[PDB]
């Protein structure tokens, strides 16, 4: 019974800067947080920074996304996301995960009054 955002956030923000690694914090998480049921996540971008910030970024800039959906924020600087993705391996439920470190802007969803932030669109 979570306000949608404490669970997108622990499905997203990760959290901790570690530039190095990859699978780990992948599988990791995904394990972590047992989202390895009856089939996993082909794509998701782990962020790997200050959660306190991720809150700014919701109240920072407004960008129009690819779309004009929503009403999504692009973060104030570039911050270390992790891109975690299914390898031309991963056979659930030997499920096998894979990231790519970059530092880009997080584009956030934020809403759900107090507004904090509920989705990702990208990061750029």
């Not at 499905?11 to 990791?28: A, E, F, V």
């Not at 794509?43 to 809150?55: G, M, Q, R, W």
């Not at 959906?69 to 991963?90: A, H, P």
Request: glycine share 4%.
């Amino acid at each position: 019974k979570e306000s949608a955002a404490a669970k997108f956030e622990r499905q997203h923000m990760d959290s901790g800067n570690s530039p190095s690694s990859s699978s780990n914090y992948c599988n990791l998480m995904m394990c972590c947080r047992k989202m390895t049921q009856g089939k996993c996540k082909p794509v998701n971008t782990f962020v790997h920074e200050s959660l306190a910030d991720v809150k700014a970024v919701c109240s920072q800039k407004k960008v129009t996304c690819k779309d004009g959906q929503t009403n999504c924020y692009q973060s104030k600087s570039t911050m270390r996301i992790t891109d975690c993705r299914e390898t031309g391996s991963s056979k659930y439920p030997n499920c096998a995960y894979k990231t790519t470190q970059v530092e880009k802007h997080i584009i956030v969803a934020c809403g759900g009054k107090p507004s904090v932030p509920v989705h990702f669109d990208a990061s750029v």
